[PDB]
Coordinates of C-alpha atoms in Angstrom, one line a residue:
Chain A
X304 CA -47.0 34.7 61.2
X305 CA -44.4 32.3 59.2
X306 CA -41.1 33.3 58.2
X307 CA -39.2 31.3 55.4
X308 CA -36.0 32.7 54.5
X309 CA -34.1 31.2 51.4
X310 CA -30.4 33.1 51.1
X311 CA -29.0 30.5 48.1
X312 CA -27.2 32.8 45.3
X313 CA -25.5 31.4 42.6
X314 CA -22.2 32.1 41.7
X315 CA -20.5 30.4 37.6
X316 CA -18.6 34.1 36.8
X317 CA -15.3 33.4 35.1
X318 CA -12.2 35.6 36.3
X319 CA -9.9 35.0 33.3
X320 CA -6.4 36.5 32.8
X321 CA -3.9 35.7 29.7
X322 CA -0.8 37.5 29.2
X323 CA 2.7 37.8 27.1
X324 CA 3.1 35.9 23.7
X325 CA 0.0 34.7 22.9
X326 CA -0.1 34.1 19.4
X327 CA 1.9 31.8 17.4
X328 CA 5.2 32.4 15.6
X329 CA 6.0 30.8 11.9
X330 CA 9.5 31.8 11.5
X331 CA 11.2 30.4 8.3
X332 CA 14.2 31.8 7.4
X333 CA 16.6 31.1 4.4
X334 CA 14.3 28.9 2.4
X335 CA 16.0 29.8 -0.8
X336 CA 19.7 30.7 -1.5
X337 CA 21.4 32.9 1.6
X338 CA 25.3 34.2 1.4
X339 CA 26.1 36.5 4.0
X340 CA 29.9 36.7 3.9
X341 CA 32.3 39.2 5.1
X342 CA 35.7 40.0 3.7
X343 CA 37.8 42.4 6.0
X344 CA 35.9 43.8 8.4
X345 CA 37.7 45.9 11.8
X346 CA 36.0 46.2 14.6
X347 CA 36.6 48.7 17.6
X348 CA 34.0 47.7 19.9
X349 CA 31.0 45.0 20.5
X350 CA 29.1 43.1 17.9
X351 CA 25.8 41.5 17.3
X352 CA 25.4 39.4 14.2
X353 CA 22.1 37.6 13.9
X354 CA 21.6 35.3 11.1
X355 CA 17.6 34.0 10.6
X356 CA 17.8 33.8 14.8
X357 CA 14.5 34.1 17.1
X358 CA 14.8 35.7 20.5
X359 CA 11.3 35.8 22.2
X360 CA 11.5 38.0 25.3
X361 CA 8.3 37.6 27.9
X362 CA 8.0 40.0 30.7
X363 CA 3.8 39.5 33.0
X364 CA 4.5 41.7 36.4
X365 CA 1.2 42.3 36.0
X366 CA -2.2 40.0 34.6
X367 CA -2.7 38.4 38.2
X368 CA -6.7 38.4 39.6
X369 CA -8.6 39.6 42.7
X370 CA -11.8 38.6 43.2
X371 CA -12.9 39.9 47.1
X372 CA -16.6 38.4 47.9
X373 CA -18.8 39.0 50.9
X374 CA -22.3 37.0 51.9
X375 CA -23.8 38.7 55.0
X376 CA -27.5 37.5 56.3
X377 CA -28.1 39.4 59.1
X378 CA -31.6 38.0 61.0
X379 CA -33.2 40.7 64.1
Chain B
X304 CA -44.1 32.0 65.2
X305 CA -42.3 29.5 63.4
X306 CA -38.6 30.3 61.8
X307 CA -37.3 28.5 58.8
X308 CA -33.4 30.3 57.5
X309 CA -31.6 28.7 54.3
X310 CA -28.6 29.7 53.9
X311 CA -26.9 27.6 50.3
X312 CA -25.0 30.0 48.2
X313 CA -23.7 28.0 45.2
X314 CA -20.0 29.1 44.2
X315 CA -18.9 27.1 41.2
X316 CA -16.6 30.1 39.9
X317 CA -13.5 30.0 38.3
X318 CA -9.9 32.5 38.9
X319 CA -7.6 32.0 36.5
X320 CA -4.4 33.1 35.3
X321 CA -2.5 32.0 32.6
X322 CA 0.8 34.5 31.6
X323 CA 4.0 34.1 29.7
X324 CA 5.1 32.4 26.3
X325 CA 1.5 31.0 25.6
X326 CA 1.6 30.8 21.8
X327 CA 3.5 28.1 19.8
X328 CA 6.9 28.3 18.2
X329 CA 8.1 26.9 15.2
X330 CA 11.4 28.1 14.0
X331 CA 13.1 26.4 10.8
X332 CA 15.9 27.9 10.3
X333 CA 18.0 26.8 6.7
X334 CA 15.9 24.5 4.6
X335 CA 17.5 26.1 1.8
X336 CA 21.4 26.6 1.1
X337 CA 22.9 29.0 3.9
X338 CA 26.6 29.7 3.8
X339 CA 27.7 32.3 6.5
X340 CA 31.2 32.5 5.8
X341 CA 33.9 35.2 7.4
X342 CA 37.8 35.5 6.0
X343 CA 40.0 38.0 7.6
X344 CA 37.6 39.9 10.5
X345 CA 39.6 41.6 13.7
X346 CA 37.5 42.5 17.2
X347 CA 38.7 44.4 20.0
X348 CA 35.8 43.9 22.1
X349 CA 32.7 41.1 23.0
X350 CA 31.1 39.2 20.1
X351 CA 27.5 37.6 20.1
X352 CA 26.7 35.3 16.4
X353 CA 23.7 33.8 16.9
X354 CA 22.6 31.6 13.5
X355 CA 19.5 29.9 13.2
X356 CA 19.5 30.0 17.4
X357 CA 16.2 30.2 19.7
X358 CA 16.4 32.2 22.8
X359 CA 12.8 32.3 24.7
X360 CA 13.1 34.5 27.8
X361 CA 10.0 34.1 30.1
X362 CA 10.1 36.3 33.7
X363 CA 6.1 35.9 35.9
X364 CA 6.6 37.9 38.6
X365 CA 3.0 38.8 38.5
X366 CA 0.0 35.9 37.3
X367 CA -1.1 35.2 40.9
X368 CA -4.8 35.0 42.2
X369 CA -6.1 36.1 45.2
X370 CA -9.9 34.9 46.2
X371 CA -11.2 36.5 49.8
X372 CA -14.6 35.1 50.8
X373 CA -16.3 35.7 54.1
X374 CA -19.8 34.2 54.5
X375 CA -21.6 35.6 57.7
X376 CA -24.8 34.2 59.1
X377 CA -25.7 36.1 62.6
X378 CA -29.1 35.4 64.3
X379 CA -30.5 37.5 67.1
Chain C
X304 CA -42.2 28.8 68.2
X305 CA -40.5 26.8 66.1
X306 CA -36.6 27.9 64.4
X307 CA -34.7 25.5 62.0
X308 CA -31.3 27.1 60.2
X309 CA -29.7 25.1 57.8
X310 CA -26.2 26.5 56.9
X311 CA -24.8 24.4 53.4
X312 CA -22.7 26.6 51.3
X313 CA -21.2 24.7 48.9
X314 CA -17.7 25.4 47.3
X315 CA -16.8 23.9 43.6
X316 CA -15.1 26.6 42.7
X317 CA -12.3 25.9 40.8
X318 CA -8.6 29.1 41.3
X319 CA -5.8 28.1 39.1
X320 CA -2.3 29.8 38.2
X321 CA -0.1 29.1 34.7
X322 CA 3.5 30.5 34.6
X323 CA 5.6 30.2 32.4
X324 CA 6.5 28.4 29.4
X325 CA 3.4 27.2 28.2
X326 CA 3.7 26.4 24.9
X327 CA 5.5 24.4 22.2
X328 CA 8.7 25.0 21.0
X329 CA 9.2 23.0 17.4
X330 CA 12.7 24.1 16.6
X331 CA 14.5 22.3 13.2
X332 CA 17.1 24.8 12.2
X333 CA 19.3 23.3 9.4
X334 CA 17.2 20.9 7.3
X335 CA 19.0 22.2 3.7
X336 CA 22.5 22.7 3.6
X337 CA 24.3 24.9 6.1
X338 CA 28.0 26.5 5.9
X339 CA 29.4 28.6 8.6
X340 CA 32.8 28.4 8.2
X341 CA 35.5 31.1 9.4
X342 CA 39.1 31.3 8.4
X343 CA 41.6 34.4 9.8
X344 CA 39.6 35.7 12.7
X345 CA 41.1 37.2 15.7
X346 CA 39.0 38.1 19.2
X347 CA 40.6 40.6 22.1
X348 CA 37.4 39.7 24.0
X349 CA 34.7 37.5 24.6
X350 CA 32.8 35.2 21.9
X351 CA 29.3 33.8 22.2
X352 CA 28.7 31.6 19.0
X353 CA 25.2 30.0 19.1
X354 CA 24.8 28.1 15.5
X355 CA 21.3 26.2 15.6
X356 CA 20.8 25.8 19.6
X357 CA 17.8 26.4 21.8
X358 CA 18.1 28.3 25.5
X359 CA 14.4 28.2 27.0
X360 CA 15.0 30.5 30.5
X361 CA 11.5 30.4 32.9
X362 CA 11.4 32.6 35.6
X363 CA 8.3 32.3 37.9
X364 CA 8.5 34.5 41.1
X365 CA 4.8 34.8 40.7
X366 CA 2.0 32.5 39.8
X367 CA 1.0 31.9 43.6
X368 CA -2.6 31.5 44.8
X369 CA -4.0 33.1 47.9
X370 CA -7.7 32.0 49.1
X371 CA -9.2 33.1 52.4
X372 CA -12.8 31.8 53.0
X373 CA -14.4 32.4 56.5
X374 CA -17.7 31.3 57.4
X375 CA -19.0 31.9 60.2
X376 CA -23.0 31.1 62.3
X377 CA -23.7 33.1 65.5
X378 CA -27.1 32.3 67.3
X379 CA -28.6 34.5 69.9
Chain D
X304 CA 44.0 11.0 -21.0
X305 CA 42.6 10.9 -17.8
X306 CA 38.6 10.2 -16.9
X307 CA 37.0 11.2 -13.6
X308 CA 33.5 11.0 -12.9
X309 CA 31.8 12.4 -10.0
X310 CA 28.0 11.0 -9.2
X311 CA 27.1 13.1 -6.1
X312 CA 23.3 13.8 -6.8
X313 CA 22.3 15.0 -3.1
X314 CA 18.5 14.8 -2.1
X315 CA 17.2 16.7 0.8
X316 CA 13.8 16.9 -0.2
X317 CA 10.5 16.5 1.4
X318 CA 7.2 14.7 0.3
X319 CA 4.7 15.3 2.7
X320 CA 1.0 14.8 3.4
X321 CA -1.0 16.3 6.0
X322 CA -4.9 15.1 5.1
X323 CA -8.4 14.8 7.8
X324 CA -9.3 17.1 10.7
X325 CA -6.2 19.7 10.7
X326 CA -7.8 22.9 12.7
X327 CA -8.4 23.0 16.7
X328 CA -12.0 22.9 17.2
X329 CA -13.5 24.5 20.6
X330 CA -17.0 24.2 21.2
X331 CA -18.4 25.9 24.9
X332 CA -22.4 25.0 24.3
X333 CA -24.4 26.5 27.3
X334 CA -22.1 28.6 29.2
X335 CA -25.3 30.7 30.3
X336 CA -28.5 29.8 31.3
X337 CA -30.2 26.9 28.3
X338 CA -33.5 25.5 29.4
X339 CA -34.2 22.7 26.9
X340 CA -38.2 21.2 27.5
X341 CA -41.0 18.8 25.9
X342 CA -44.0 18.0 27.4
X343 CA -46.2 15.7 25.7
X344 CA -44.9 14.4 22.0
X345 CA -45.5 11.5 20.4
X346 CA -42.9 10.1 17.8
X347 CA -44.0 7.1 15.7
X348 CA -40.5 6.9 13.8
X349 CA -37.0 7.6 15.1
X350 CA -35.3 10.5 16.8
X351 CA -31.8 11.7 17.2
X352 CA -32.0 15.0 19.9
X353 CA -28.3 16.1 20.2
X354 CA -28.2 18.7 23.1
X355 CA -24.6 20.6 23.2
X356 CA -22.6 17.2 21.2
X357 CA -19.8 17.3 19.2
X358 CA -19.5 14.8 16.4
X359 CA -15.8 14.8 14.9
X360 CA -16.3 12.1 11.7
X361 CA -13.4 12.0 9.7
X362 CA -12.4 9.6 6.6
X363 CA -9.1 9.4 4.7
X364 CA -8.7 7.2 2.1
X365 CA -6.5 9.3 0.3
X366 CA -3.1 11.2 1.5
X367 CA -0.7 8.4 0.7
X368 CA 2.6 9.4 -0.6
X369 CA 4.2 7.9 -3.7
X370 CA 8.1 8.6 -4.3
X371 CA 9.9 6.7 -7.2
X372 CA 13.8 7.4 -8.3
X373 CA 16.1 6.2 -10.4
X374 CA 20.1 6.0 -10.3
X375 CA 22.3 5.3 -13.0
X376 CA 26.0 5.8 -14.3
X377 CA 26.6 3.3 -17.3
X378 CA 30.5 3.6 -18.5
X379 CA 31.4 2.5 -22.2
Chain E
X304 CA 45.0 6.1 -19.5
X305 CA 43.5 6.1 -15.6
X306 CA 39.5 5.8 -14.3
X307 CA 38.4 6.8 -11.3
X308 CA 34.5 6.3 -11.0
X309 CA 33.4 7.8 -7.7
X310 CA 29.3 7.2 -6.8
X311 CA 28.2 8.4 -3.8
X312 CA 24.7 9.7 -4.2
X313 CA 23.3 11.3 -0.7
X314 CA 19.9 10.8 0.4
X315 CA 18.8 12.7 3.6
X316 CA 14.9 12.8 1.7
X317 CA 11.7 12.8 4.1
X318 CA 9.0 10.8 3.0
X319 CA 6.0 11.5 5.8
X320 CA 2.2 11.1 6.1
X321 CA -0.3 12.3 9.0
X322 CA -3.8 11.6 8.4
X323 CA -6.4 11.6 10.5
X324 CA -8.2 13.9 13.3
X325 CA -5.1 16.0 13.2
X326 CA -6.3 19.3 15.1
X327 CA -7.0 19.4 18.9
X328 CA -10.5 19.5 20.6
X329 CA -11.9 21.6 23.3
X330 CA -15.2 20.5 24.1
X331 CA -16.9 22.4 27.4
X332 CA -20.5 21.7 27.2
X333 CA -22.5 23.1 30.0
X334 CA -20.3 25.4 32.2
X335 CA -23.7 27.7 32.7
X336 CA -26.9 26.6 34.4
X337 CA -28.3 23.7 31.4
X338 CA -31.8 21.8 32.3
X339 CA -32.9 19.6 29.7
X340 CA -36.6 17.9 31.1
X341 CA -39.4 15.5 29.4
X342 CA -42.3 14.6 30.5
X343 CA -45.6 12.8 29.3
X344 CA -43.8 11.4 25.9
X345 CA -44.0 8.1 23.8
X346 CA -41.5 7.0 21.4
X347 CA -42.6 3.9 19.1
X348 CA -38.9 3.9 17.4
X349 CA -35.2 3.9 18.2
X350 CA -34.3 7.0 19.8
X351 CA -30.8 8.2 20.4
X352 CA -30.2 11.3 23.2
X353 CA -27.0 13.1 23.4
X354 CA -26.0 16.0 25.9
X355 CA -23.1 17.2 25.9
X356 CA -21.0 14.0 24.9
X357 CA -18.0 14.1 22.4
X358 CA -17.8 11.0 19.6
X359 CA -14.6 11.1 17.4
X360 CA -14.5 8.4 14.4
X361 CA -11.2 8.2 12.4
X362 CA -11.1 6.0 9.6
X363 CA -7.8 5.9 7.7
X364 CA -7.5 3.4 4.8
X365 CA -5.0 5.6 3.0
X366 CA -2.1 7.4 4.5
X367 CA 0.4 4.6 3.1
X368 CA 3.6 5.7 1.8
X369 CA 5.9 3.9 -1.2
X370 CA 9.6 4.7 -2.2
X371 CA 10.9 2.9 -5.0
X372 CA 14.4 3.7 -5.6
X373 CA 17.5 1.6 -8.0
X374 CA 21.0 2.6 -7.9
X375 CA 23.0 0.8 -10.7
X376 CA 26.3 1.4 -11.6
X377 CA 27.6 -1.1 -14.2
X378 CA 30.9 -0.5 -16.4
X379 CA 31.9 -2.1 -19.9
Chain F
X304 CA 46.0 1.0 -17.2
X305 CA 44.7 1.6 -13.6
X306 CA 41.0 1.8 -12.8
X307 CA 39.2 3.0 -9.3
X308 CA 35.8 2.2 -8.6
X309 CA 34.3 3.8 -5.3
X310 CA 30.5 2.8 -4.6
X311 CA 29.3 4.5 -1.4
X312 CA 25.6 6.0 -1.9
X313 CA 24.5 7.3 1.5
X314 CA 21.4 6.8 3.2
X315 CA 19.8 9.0 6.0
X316 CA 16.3 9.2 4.5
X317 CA 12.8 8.9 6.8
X318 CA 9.9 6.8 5.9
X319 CA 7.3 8.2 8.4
X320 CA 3.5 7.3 9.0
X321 CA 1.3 8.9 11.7
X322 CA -2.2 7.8 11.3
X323 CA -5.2 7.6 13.4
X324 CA -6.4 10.3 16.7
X325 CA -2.9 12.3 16.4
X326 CA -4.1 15.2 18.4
X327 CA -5.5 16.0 21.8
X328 CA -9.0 15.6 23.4
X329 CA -9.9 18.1 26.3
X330 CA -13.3 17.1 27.1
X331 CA -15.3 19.0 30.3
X332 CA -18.5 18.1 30.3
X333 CA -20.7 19.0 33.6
X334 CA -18.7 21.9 34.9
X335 CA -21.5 24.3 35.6
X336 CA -25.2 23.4 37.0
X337 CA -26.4 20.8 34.7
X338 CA -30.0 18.7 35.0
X339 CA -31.5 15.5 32.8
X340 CA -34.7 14.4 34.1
X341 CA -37.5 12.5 32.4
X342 CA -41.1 11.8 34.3
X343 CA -43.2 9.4 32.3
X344 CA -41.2 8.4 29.1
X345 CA -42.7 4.6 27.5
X346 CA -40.2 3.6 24.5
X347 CA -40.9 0.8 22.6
X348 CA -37.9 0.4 20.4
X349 CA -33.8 0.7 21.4
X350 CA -32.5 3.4 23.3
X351 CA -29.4 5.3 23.2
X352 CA -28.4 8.3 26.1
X353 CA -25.1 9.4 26.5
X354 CA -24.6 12.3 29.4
X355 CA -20.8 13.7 29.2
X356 CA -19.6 10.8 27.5
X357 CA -16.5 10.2 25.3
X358 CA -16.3 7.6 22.3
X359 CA -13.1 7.5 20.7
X360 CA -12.9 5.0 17.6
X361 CA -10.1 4.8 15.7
X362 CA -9.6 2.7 12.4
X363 CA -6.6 2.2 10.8
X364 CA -6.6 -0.5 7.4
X365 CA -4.1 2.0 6.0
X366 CA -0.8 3.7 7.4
X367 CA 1.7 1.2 6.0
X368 CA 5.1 1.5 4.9
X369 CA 6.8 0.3 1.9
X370 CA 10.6 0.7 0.9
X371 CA 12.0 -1.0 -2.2
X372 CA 15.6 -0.3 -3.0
X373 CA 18.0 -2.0 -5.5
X374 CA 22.0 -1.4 -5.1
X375 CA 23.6 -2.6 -7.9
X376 CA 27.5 -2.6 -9.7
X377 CA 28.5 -5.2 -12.3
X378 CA 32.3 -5.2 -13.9
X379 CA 33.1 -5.9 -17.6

């Protein structure tokens, strides 16, 4: 008897990761008229002022891909 | 007897990673009339002002791939 | 009796790693008219002013690529 | 008497035109399995077959900008 | 009496066109398993095949832009 | 009797055209497993076949700039 043995799979699959800011930001701020003023003011301790600022903060730790394969053809 | 072993496995995958600020930015800060102004202020301690200003912060410690592939033919 | 074994894997596939900044920054801030102007002011400690600047920071520890690929034909 | 006259007209503004193909466009034809077949036709006029194409036709005649302005201070 | 005439119009104006095929493309035809197969057929006419190509026609007659602008300052 | 005549108009203004195949072409044709094939085809008038082909055309008649501008002061 004849053996033949054909051992040919195909592999295409995507593994895919995307991660943090993805979308898109449109951030437009004053435009029209903008007075913020300050007169007096006393301060003790720390300040933030943020006027029409854009802080974009990313952390990925993660999103990374593992893709363990194995072929075995094991003949008598 | 005769024998006749194929072994073609096709890999045309893909592993992929893509991580952090991904997404488009468009900041326009002003356009209109902006007037931040400050008379007579006193601090005793550390001052951030940030106006109109872009900070993008981007940490990947993760995104990586990892692909393991063992084939194994083994006859008689 | 007769054996033929024809080992031909073939690799295309394709593992790719990202990090980072990825994409655009379209920053314009002024454009109209913009006054910051300050007049009395007195600091004990430190001052960050940031009026209409860009800090892009990228940190990639990650984003590396591992493949292992063993193949391997044993007869008799 | 005194005469002071103060032409300081200030123009920041903007005429813009953005005119054609604006969006992204992403075409993934196939992708799984497509099995396009003809076996025996006969065409006595003309064919066009478009198999997974992209055709991006874009006319602008149009979208021209136009900006006319007129300055003047005549004294006595 | 004294005259003091001061002109001193500002112009900081954008006048700005983009016209066109504007918008990015992503074209991945295929990517899967794709067989396109003929076999016995007759064409008496022009025939035109595409698979999986990309044309992009721009035409742009238009997108022109005109400013026009007259200062005049004329006294007695 | 004293007079002062100060003519200083300011010009920053931008005339900008952009016209034509302003954005980006990602084109990935194949990719996958992809097969053409054609036995016993006659054709008796023109051909065309484009496999994974790009045709950019790009006309631009239009996209021209035109600034006219007339400074003028005349004294008694």
């Amino acid at each position: 008897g004849s053996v033949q043995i054909v051992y040919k799979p195909v592999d295409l699959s995507k593994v895919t990761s995307k991660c943090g800011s993805l979308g898109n930001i449109h951030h437009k701020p004053g435009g029209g008229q903008v007075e913020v003023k300050s007169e007096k003011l006393d301060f003790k301790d720390r300040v933030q002022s943020k006027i029409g600022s854009l802080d974009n903060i990313t952390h990925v730790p993660g999103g990374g891909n593992k893709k363990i394969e194995t072929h075995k053809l094991t003949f008598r």
